[PDB]
RNA sequence: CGGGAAACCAAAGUCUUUGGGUUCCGGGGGGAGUAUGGUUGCAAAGCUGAAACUUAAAGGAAUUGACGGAAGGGCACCACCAGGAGUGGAGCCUGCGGCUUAAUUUGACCAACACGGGAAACCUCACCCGGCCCGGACACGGACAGGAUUGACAGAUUGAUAGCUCUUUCUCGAUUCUGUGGGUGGUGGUGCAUGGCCGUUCUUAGUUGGUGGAGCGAUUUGUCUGGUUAAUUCCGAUAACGAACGAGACUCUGGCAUGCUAACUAGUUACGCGACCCCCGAGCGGUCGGCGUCCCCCAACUUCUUAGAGGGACAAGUGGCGUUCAGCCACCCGAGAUUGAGCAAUAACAGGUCUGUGAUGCCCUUAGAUGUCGGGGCUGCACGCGCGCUACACUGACUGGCUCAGCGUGUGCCUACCCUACGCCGGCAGGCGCGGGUAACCCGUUGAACCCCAUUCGUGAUGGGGAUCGGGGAUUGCAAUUAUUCCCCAUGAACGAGGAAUUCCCAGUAAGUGCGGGUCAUAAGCUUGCGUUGAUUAAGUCCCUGCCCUUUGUACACACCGCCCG
RNA sequence: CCUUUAACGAGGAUCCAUUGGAGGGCAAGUCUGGUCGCAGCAGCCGCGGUAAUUCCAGCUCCAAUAGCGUAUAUUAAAGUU
């Protein structure tokens, strides 16, 4: 935002960096394809596989997921085509575990 | 502030040998004793404890910054 | 907390004084703070008299849960004489002490002595 | 009258004490006046009229707040007008962001940003990289007097002269070590778990209960139509009456004493003077007069200086004006009813502070330690912003000469340290020898700057400006490199009055100018106080920005930085 | 089968009472451990974002009781026909 306020009641903040799960069993990264709307959102997986990630509370109105850029997506136990975002990244993040040789070499930012 | 960090050697503190202690008056008849190497001498030393036999180093364990003979 | 600010009151109130004031900020019933104030007769708060004809303490107590402030105040009553301990004069509103005499009866005579 | 949820209504009255006659019509909010079939119409459409599915609110009246590009009053140089000086432009200092880095520690975004006393060499220090130490209480068990255990030379190793480690072999003697249980430390985290403190709303005039009154109640009256004040300040009105907090009163400071009190750790005057000095003036040089110093007292005094007790100013008097009330304006006397500060209500903020606190909850960490030594960093730059400093010359610079001040402070303290006169040596920084000061006593009759008086330069990026940069000399310290500070010579940049914007100020005030204190081993371009020189412009207003009171409107109450439609 | 009668047949450890609930409506925990807007609970209102009186468990307590819970039709509550 442009400063404004009330925007201090509640918790500043920030990310004092910090580090770094991966994938796990069904709990991988993705990419942001779309940017619906409503609440929800589009993302395909970087194995192959496309899905619908949908977005996890707290992670609501505390941190915005613009479009294009990694992410970490939980996949639904059960269910193939709607899957469960978690805990985005960083683009230096990403970048880094890119230059790691963890995720596939294929997505720019 | 963070947790320490593995390191690849630590050790404290030797464990200063288990050594045999007292043969260091020597017996072959009585009421001789058969003293070895000279017994310290200084003045603040008491003369009761031995001088150690170190040789090509020669050194009282009293002291403890003095008084080091090495011939 | 409430019974004990009351038994605390009556008592600074009948040994005497003009007035007084408890505070106890901090937490009870919940995580979050308040604040209670207890408060009977005058008080003052500007000027000079409050070094005179109030005193004021602080005290910290302990609990399982954080920490509460205590806080008292009470307003000293001497102004007629004594020990002389405060200053006789009253001090928010500086009062005129009056005293009253109005009599004559008189007529012409000469009473010699 | 009576009714009604209230607004209101002699009807919307005569209703749980329910019934005069009769017609039409309603059943949470959407879906929807849509779908569908019927009917009427030239057309446009009218009348008649569902469900599936969806949702816990939609809606009415009234009250209290907030908000209004609504209305009426009042107020502020953090608002304006009238103006003064600047900032933004240039160079430099410093704080902040971004970037870099092994680390470039961290809080804070009107009410952060020369702020955290935060001008960091080490220390500080929280950061980064190496090394060492335990200062792990206490309990229980184990070990154990040919013994638990302690320390160390040299050599090797090591930044290291850390027995840290290893080689080597003496020394210490129940203090311990080892295991388990349990503590302890932390500038570790959480100011959205808290105490305390501080800032801000808010420098305005606001705030509350009792008893009575008015309402089903939330609430309201008291706290006001009007006049008046800087002010909820008074006058007056009055279903309210009598009170409380803030305002004021108060404290400190300035301005008025030839009145009072009393002074070799304060002065003045008077001689006594004797001494020096020049006739400089009458006279002769003496004396009389003039210049300061020594001499001064058992002299006289307290005007000056010092600090105590008191007095003085009240809208007091006069003239206007006002209800003739409360007050307001002018004038005399004179110090005019305002010299400047301190103290300051109710309620609130998810404001700041766990890095002031042996204040503190919970969580974390605790021997391979977040508890100690050595080194590095907080100063690293293609960039953005803030507070300031110095400048752009002649109302000046430069070199001589003259002449005036105040608030303070100072060794005997923290652990090793003060302020300096005088003598000597050096261009200077400085060195060295002696002496005083617990301080109205010594430094210091604080012999300061701007200013004042006389030379030189001449409209020239000049001799204005002093950035950048080379070499050399001193001082502090254990250590000065990324230059601690100071001095000498040389080098000589931007800059020739500054866009869009914007800050602050009304009388010893603005501006110019120096000094003391704070931090301090060495060192202010900072902050806090003090003197000196000393203007122009206003005596107003609600235009902008904002604030107080009333009235009004509201779909707002997370309160317009609101809510809400396709 | 029932009633009637021999003989065996009770020391609480077993000759074993369960079904729901404990934030409010509504009788009963601001107890302990785990989870941390996840998993779940919740007729309704609402609980969970690391200090959960509502979740998952333990202990304790409350209601009814040889019965108790849940779904659906329907009446009373409804002067909301």
């Known amino acids: ?109 | 502030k963070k947790s320490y960090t593995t390191p690849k050697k630590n050790k404290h503190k030797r464990k200063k040998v288990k050594l045999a202690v007292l043969k260091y008056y020597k017996v072959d008849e009585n009421g001789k004793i058969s003293r070895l190497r000279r017994e310290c001498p200084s003045d603040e030393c008491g003369a009761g404890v031995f001088m150690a036999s170190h040789f090509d180093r020669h050194y009282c364990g009293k002291c403890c910054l003095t008084y080091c003979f090495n011939k | 907390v409430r019974r004990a600010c009351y038994g605390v009151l009556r008592f600074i109130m009948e040994s005497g004084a003009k007035g007084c004031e408890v505070v106890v900020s901090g937490k009870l019933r919940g995580q979050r703070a308040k604040s209670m104030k207890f408060v009977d007769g005058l008080m003052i708060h500007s000027g000079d008299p409050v070094n005179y004809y109030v005193d004021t303490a602080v005290r910290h107590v302990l609990l399982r849960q954080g920490v509460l402030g205590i806080k008292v105040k009470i307003m000293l009553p001497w102004d007629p004489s004594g020990k002389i301990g405060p200053k006789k004069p009253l001090p928010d509103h500086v009062s005129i002490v009056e005293p009253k005499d109005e009599i004559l009866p008189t007529t012409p005579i000469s009473e010699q002595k």
């Open chain 1, 1 to 109: 935002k442009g400063g404004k306020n009330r925007r201090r009641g509640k918790n500043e903040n920030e990310s004092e960096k910090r580090e770094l799960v991966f994938k796990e069993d069904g709990q991988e990264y993705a990419q942001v394809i779309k940017m619906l709307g409503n609440g929800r959102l589009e993302a395909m997986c970087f194995d192959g596989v496309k899905r619908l990630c949908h977005i996890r509370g707290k992670l609501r109105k505390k941190v915005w997921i613009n479009t294009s850029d990694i992410i970490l997506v939980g996949l639904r136990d059960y269910q193939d085509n709607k899957a469960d975002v978690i805990l985005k990244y960083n683009a230096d993040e990403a970048r880094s575990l890119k230059a790691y040789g963890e995720l596939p070499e294929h997505a720019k930012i």
